[PDB]
RNA sequence: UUAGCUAGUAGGUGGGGUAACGGCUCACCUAGGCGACGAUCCCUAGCUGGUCUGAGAGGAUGACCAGCCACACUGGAACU
RNA sequence: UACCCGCAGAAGAAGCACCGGCUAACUCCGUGCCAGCAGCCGCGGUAAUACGGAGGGUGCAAGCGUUAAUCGGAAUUACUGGGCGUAAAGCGCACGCAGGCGGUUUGUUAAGUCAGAUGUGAAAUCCCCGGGCUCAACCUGGGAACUGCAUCUGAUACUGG
């Protein structure tokens, strides 16, 4: 099925996660359908560090896609503060 | 390390055979003056 | 040189042969000394120059210069050989590598030791 | 990664003062500045066109402390930028920390100022920077930290900065031991004995 | 609103079927000269109607044999 | 006042009953660092005698060229015998990127910024002819205003 | 035989300009007159006339300055062998300003400059210097 | 210094087959189809995004990362 | 674990290639067309700045050299951008099918051509402006670019019909 998940990138011990509407069979860093936002867990906290696209995630959940554990938490947390 | 001579198989007398190899052969010298002595360049300039 | 002529038959990039084809684009190869011998050079030079015939791991049997002053190669010494032309001396397109496998390096160098495989003298 | 040798062999090969000993003692007492270094110096050469381009690059390198692999990288950057590639290249050497230290006059030489920098005596904007090639920006403060106000080196060095010329592009405030890199220096602000066109010609062969 | 090529009719020995050269003027990639490059096509003609030499017009439908995926919309010029 | 390079010094020769009479050619350019350039080519039996005959032959025999801010007006070609020679104006801080004999001529002409390239032969004497051939036929925006009888925003 | 008559006009200029002729004639056509006009508006030639009904004859009058030609040089670019079209960003400029291309656009023959203002490209006929 | 290749071959009608169009398969019928815009045959090769070089146009290349293909001791075949 | 603080003492940490020209850097001693060097020219036959050693110097520097391989330089396959009287190069001469090219004028068409719009040209890479690792490599946000292909609407000077 179609999912919404984090692909890892970044250097070693300093990850960085793109957020990617994939088919679930494809490998983590491989073939995605869309990119939708990002997530930096090492961020400075004076300067962004997470940005989802809530308008295009809600579209893909419409058409009937899953979400991860993490991408769920990131949606909960980017609707509290913003 | 053994000279590889241009004579084939030596058959009798080897000194007289090597005498007629390029191994030996007159060495003449370039004159530095007169009558075959022109350089373009010269060793440094 | 007419445009129309080049459409129908375009320009041939003339493709270049290598000077070291026994290597086959390996940067060295290994082989075995068949035979080791001095020979006289081309004109105008005068000398005796040390070269071995050598059968490579890819079949090719080729002759090979030996650098430096003095050596101990012979029948069946296993040696490493590299590209490198020698002029005063016809048909010799490869050098032996000194100080690699069964050529030990040169006795009593001080200058340019790395080209002859000679360890820094302890002082 | 650093020239460890005799500093006046370098100054004789250029035929120039490269500022590599401070000026407690002046230059012409110590060495022989007119005569070139080693055995065959008093004989002139006809120095070739490659020669004079090389000789000029190595003057600049040997002032600022920089080695070739690193200098070549400054040159790539300096060309990448928009501007005269000579003027840009000298901006990027007057940006360097170890130099900016010395031009504010906490070091006596660039080799001293580099030992400050490496030994964690320098902050930039509060943070301890300890690497010589750090590129200072406009409106950064550089300043000494609190062990290293109590050194004899730094006080005696600030005496020697009053006898040299003043840089325009720094505001130093020398009782505190800080100062503000205000703007990038222009070509007019720097020494005009350095030809820069020779370096650029060199690399674009 | 259908994509529709034109051409002309370089055989018609086959039964309900013709062969139709499409010309086009391509710039050569290197030398800059514009060139006649031809594109032959087997085409479905119902009614055996189209003669040899005839200008014609054709469209891409589903596959109809091994070769044909092209069917004949209308004739334009003919009998010449 | 004016700047004066020595490009090249051949030894040439002439045969006689005796054997060879050797002799030296030198080749010099002079210029006012500001759009004037001569070249001269001396011969003599000693070398410093020959450079001197060239420096004289260069001062007289010396031509004007309209530069623009220390570079060319527009991209010029030039040719003499085997030597073809293309030069192109450049943005400030290129320097004179350019060959052997070319590089001399442009420096004392007071070009500061060019992209040259010598095709063909690179015989020093025929290249400084081809380079000067280039620079002298090259033509300003004020000259072509006059030619056609305009003075437009092409200016 | 006679297979590019624009190149013929351009050569007839060039060769007259070399031989110090006041004027040159050729067979007319529409397109020759179009070009002849651009060449005149830009000031390389003094004036052209056309005479004849049945076999018309274009007579250009050539132009000199310091006892020396105005038309320094004049290439054909698009030939019959090799037609050369260009989009509006890709238009050449000739001596980095100072000469002129001549372009056939859908709004007639004009200079390179006047096709950049009008925002067109097309077949490039000829450079002039 | 490979010029003629092709008889399920090229098209038709009808049966069968496939998730699906189809000589995919079969029987009958027509005698076509491809080719100097290089068919056929031989040699070499996984393809691309890219990479290196070059002022550029070009040339060389396809290791890592990513997309597609193919293979799983060699050959053949199905089953679920 | 990054990162931060304390202790001791200049302590524990410099080599490789080159110096005849091209090419930055020169002098002694040995050797005597021998030994050897050499990328190309070439050096060496008793005063070797070219061999071997020493002293000095130049260049790179935790690397420095040799070899192999690609592009460059090479306008030496030349589209950009070469030639063919004697340097390599005009078939021994013609006729002529495919092919390429085609005088002048009006109309029409709109294939080439040009302009505009939409769709696509995966992400990474490259380039620009930023941000984060003390700096840098490295990572990353936004853009530009992907010169292409298709569809639609115009233009009609040139080419074609």
Question: D50 and chain F: CB distance < 8 Å anywhere?
Answer: no
Q: Which residue is nearest to nucleotide I115 (CA to C1')?
A: G120
Is G74 within 8 Å of G14 (Cβ atoms)? yes
Domain spans in chain C, listed from the N-terminal domain onward: 1-123
CATH fold for the domain made of G1-71: Ribosomal Protein S8; Chain: A, domain 1 (3.30.1370)
Backbone φ and ψ for C84, nearest 5 degrees, come out as 140, 115
Q: What is the DSSP string of D12-70?
A: HHHTS----S-SSS-HHHHS-SSSPSSTT-SS-----HHHHHHHHHHHHHHHHT--HHH
Cβ of E34 within 8 Å of Cβ of G81? The answer is no
Closest-CA residue of chain C to E29: C7
> Which residues partner with D19 through β-bridges?
none
As a rounded value in angstroms, the CA-to-C1' distance for C120 and I64 is 14
Q: What is the DSSP string of chain D?
A: ----S-HHHHHHHHTS----S-SSS-HHHHS-SSSPSSTT-SS-----HHHHHHHHHHHHHHHHT--HHHHHHHHHHHHHSSS-HHHHHHHHHHSBHHHHHHHHTSSSSHHHHHHHHHTT-EEETTEE---TT-BPPTTEEEEE-TTTTS-HHHHHHHHHHTTSPPPSSEEEETTTTEEEE-SPPPTTTS-TT--SHHHHHHHT-
Outline where DSSP puts E strands in G1-129: 23-27, 47-51, 57-61, 74-76, 85-86, 100-105, 108-111, 122-128
Cβ of C37 within 8 Å of Cβ of B23? The answer is no
As ranges, strand I nucleotides with an atom below 7 A of a protein CB are 4-5, 14-18, 20-27, 33-45, 49-50, 52-62, 64-70, 74-75, 77-79, 82-84, 99-106, 111-116, 122-123, 127-129, 131-136, 138-141, 150-152, 154-159
G103 vs G78: CA distance, rounded Å? 10
Instruction: Report strand pairing: E70-75 vs E42-44.
Output: parallel
User: D34 with D88, same domain?
Assistant: yes
> Which residues partner with G32 through β-bridges?
none
Is C66 within 8 Å of C116 (Cβ atoms)? no
Closest-CA residue of chain C to B3: C38
As a rounded value in angstroms, the CA-to-C1' distance for B5 and I3 is 76
- Encoding tokens for residue G92? 């050449």
Is G33 within 8 Å of G58 (Cβ atoms)? yes
Instruction: Report strand pairing: D178-181 vs F76-80.
Output: unpaired
Strand, helix or coil at G111? Answer: strand
Other beta carbons within 10 angstroms of residue E22's beta carbon come to 15
Is C115 within 8 Å of C99 (Cβ atoms)? no
Cβ of B4 within 8 Å of Cβ of C37? The answer is yes
In the stretch 34-93 of chain G, residues with CB closer than 8 A to chain E read: 81-84
Backbone φ and ψ for F88, nearest 5 degrees, come out as -145, 135
Q: Which residue is nearest to nucleotide I82 (CA to C1')?
A: C1
User: D54 with D110, same domain?
Assistant: no
Q: Which of C37, C71, C73 sits opposite B3 (nearest CB)?
A: C37
Q: Do chains F and G touch (3 or more CB pairs under 8 A)?
A: yes
D178 vs D200: CA distance, rounded Å? 35
Identify the residue among C1, C2, C5, C7 best suited for mutation to test binding to E, counting E beta carbons within 10 A and taking the highest: C7
Give the domain range for residue D42: 7-93+190-203
- Encoding tokens for residue E4? 């529709």
Is E16 within 8 Å of E45 (Cβ atoms)? yes
Question: E34 and chain G: CB distance < 8 Å anywhere?
Answer: yes
Q: Which of C37, C46, C71 sits opposite B2 (nearest CB)?
A: C37
Residue D8 half-sphere exposure, CB side, CA atoms within 13 Å? 12
CATH of the domain at D49: 1.10.1050.10
To 10 degrees, what angle do helices D152-161 and D110-118 make? 140
Outline where DSSP puts E strands in F1-155: 3-15, 20-31, 36-44, 62-64, 76-80, 83-89, 96-97, 114-120
As a rounded value in angstroms, the CA-to-C1' distance for E71 and I21 is 77
Cβ < 7 Å from nucleic strand H? A 26-27, 29-31; C 8, 13; E 11, 13-17, 19, 29-30, 36-38, 40, 42, 44, 62-68
Q: Which of C21, C27, C32, C74 is nearest to C50 (CA)?
A: C74
Checking D55-59 for CB contacts under 8 A at 24+ apart, the result is D55/D13, D55/D14, D56/D194, D56/D195, D56/D198, D56/D199, D56/D202, D57/D198, D57/D199, D57/D202, D58/D13, D58/D14, D59/D14, D59/D16, D59/D18, D59/D194
Q: Which of F93, F97, F103 sits opposite D84 (nearest CB)?
A: F93
Give the CA angle between residues D54, D57, D58 to the nearest 5°: 85
Q: Which nucleotide is nearest to G115 (CA to C1')?
A: I114
Domain spans in chain G, listed from the N-terminal domain onward: 1-71, 72-129
Q: Which of C49, C87, C40, C52 is nearest to B23 (CA)?
A: C40
Closest-CA residue of chain B to C45: B27
Cβ of B2 within 8 Å of Cβ of C46? The answer is no
Chain E nearest CA to G82, separation (Å) = 6
In the stretch 3-22 of chain C, residues with CB closer than 8 A to chain G read: 3-4
Q: Longest Cα pair distance anywhere in chain A, in angstroms? A: 37
Backbone φ and ψ for F146, nearest 5 degrees, come out as -75, -50
Q: Looking at beta carbons, which residues of chain E come within 8 Å of G81?
A: 33
Chain G nearest CA to E33, separation (Å) = 6
Q: Which of F138, F135, F140 is nearest to F62 (CA)?
A: F135
Q: Which CATH class is domain G72-129?
A: alpha beta
Report the residue count for chain B.
45
Q: Which nucleotide is nearest to D131 (CA to C1')?
A: I135
Q: Looking at beta carbons, which residues of chain F come within 8 Å of G65?
A: 146-147
Closest-CA residue of chain C to E32: C3
Is C55 within 8 Å of C67 (Cβ atoms)? no
Q: Which CATH class is domain C1-123?
A: mainly beta
Order of strands, sheet of F3-15, starting from the edge strand that comes earlier in the sequence: F3-15, F20-31, F36-44, F62-64
Cβ of G84 within 8 Å of Cβ of E34? The answer is no
Q: Which nucleotide is nearest to C42 (CA to C1')?
A: I33
Residue D173 half-sphere exposure, CB side, CA atoms within 13 Å? 11
User: D13 with D89, same domain?
Assistant: yes
Question: G3 and chain C: CB distance < 8 Å anywhere?
Answer: no
Strand, helix or coil at F5? Answer: strand
Q: How many structural domains does chain D have?
A: 2
Question: C72 and chain B: CB distance < 8 Å anywhere?
Answer: no
Q: Looking at beta carbons, which residues of chain C come within 8 Å of E35?
A: 7
As ranges, strand H nucleotides with an atom below 7 A of a protein CB are 10-13, 21-24, 30-35, 37, 58-60, 65-68
- Encoding tokens for residue F36? 């004037």
Cβ of F141 within 8 Å of Cβ of G65? The answer is no
CATH of the domain at D118: 3.10.290.10
- Encoding tokens for residue B20? 């007629």
- DSSP designation for C111: T
Q: Looking at beta carbons, which residues of chain G come within 8 Å of E32?
A: 82, 84
In a domain, D2, yes or no: no
Q: Which of C100, C108, C102, C40 is nearest to C74 (CA)?
A: C102
Instruction: Convert F80-114 to b/e letters by CB count within 10 Å (16 or more is b).
Output: beebbbbbbbbeebbbbbbbebbbbbbbbbbbbbb
F71 vs F112: CA distance, rounded Å? 6
Q: Which residue is nearest to nucleotide I57 (CA to C1')?
A: D38
F149 vs G112: CA distance, rounded Å? 19
Cβ of C2 within 8 Å of Cβ of G82? The answer is no
Neighbours of chain G (3+ CB pairs under 8 A): C, E, F
Q: Which residue is nearest to nucleotide I73 (CA to C1')?
A: D205
Q: Do chains C and B touch (3 or more CB pairs under 8 A)?
A: yes
H or E segment and range at residue F137: helix F124-137
Q: Which of F25, F28, F127 is nearest to F82 (CA)?
A: F127
> Which residues partner with E8 through β-bridges?
E21, E55
Is G86 within 8 Å of G111 (Cβ atoms)? no
F112 vs F92: CA distance, rounded Å? 8
Cβ of B4 within 8 Å of Cβ of C39? The answer is yes
> Which residues partner with F25 through β-bridges?
F10, F43
| Way the structure was solved | cryo-EM
Q: Which of B1, B2, B23 sits opposite C40 (nearest CB)?
A: B23
Q: Looking at beta carbons, which residues of chain D come within 8 Å of F97?
A: 201, 204
Q: Omega of the bond prior to F93 within 30 degrees of 0, cis?
A: no
Is C65 within 8 Å of C50 (Cβ atoms)? yes
Q: Longest Cα pair distance anywhere in chain C, in angstroms? A: 74
What lies within 8 Å, CB to CB, of G67 at 6+ separation is none
- Encoding tokens for residue G108? 């007639």
- DSSP designation for F108: H
Helices marked H in G3-111:
5-18, 30-41
D22 vs D30: CA distance, rounded Å? 12
Alpha carbon distance, N-terminus to C-terminus of chain D: 26
């Amino acid at each position: 099925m179609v999912t919404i998940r984090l692909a890892r990138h970044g250097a070693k011990k300093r990850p960085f996660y793109q957020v990617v509407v994939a088919d679930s069979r494809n490998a983590r860093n491989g073939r995605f359908i869309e990119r939708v936002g990002f997530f930096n867990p090492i961020a400075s906290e004076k300067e962004e560090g997470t940005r989802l696209d809530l308008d295009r995630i809600a579209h893909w959940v419409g058409q009937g896609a899953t979400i991860s554990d993490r991408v769920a938490a990131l949606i909960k947390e980017v609707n509290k503060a913003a | 390390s053994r000279y590889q001579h241009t004579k084939g198989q030596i058959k009798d007398n080897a000194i007289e055979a090597l005498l007629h190899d390029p191994l030996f052969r007159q060495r003449v010298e370039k004159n530095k003056k007169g009558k075959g002595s022109y350089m373009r360049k010269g060793k440094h300039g | 040189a007419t445009v129309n002529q080049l459409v129908r038959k375009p320009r041939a990039r003339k493709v270049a042969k290598s000077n070291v084809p026994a290597l086959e684009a390996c940067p060295q190869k290994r082989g075995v000394c068949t035979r080791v011998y001095t020979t006289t050079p081309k004109k105008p030079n005068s000398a005796l120059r040390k070269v071995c015939r050598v059968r490579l791991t890819n079949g090719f049997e080729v002759t090979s210069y030996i650098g430096g002053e003095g050596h101990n190669l012979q029948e069946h010494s296993v040696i490493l050989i590299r590209g490198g032309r020698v002029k005063d001396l016809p048909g010799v397109r490869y050098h032996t590598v000194r100080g690699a496998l069964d050529c030990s390096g040169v006795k009593d160098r001080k200058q340019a030791r790395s080209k002859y495989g000679v360890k820094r003298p302890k002082a | 990664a650093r020239y460890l040798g005799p500093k006046l062999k370098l100054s004789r090969r250029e035929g120039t003062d490269l500022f590599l000993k401070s000026g407690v003692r002046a230059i012409d007492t110590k060495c022989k500045i007119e005569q070139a270094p080693g055995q065959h110096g008093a004989r002139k050469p006809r120095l070739s066109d490659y020669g004079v381009q090389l000789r000029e690059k190595q003057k600049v390198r040997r002032i600022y402390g920089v080695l070739e692999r690193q200098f070549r990288n400054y040159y790539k950057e300096a060309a990448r930028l928009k501007g005269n590639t000579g003027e840009n290249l000298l901006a990027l050497l007057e940006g360097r920390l170890d130099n900016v230290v010395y031009r504010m006059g906490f070091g006596a030489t660039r080799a001293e100022a580099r030992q400050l920098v490496s030994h964690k005596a320098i902050m930039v904007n509060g943070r301890v920077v300890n690497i010589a090639s750090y590129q200072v920006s406009p409106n950064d403060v550089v300043s000494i930290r609190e062990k290293a106000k109590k050194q004899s080196r730094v006080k005696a060095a600030l005496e020697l900065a009053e006898q040299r010329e003043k840089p325009t592009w720094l505001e130093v405030d020398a009782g505190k031991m800080e100062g503000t890199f205000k703007r990038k220096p222009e070509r007019s602000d720097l020494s005009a004995d350095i030809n820069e066109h020779l370096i650029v010609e060199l690399y674009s062969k | 609103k259908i994509r529709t090529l034109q051409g002309r009719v370089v055989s018609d020995k086959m039964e309900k079927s013709i062969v139709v050269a499409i010309e086009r003027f391509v710039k050569h990639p290197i030398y800059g000269k514009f060139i006649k490059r031809t594109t032959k096509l087997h085409v479905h003609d119902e009614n055996n109607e189209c003669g040899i030499g005839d200008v014609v017009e054709i469209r891409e439908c589903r596959p109809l044999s091994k070769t044909k995926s092209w069917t004949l919309v209308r004739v334009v010029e003919k009998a010449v | 006042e004016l700047q004066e390079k020595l490009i090249a010094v051949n030894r040439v020769s002439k045969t006689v009953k005796g054997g060879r009479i050797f002799s030296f050619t030198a080749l010099t350019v002079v210029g006012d660092g500001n759009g004037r350039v001569g070249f001269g080519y001396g011969k003599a039996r000693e070398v410093p005698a020959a450079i001197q005959k060239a420096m004289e032959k260069a001062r007289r025999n010396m031509i004007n060229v309209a530069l623009n801010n220390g570079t060319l007006q527009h991209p010029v070609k030039g040719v003499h015998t085997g030597s073809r020679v293309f030069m192109q104006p450049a943005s400030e801080g290129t320097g004179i990127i350019a060959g052997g004999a070319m590089r001399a001529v442009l420096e004392v002409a007071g070009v500061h910024n060019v992209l040259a390239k010598a095709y063909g032969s690179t015989n020093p004497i025929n290249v400084v002819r081809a380079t000067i051939d280039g620079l002298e036929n090259m033509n300003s925006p004020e000259m072509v205003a006059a030619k056609r009888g305009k003075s437009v925003e092409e200016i | 035989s006679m297979q590019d008559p624009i190149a013929d006009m351009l050569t007839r200029i060039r060769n007259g300009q070399a031989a110090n002729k006041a004027a040159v004639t050729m067979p007319s056509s529409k397109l020759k007159v179009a070009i002849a006009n651009v060449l005149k508006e830009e000031g390389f030639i003094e004036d052209f006339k056309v005479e004849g009904d049945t076999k018309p004859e274009l007579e250009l009058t050539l132009k000199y300055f310091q006892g020396k030609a105005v038309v320094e040089s004049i290439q054909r670019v698009s030939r019959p062998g090799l037609r050369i079209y260009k989009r509006k960003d890709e238009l050449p400029k000739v001596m980095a300003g100072l000469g002129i291309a001549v372009v056939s656009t859908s709004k007639g023959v004009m200079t390179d400059r006047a096709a950049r203002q009008a925002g067109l490209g097309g077949e490039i006929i000829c450079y002039v210097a």
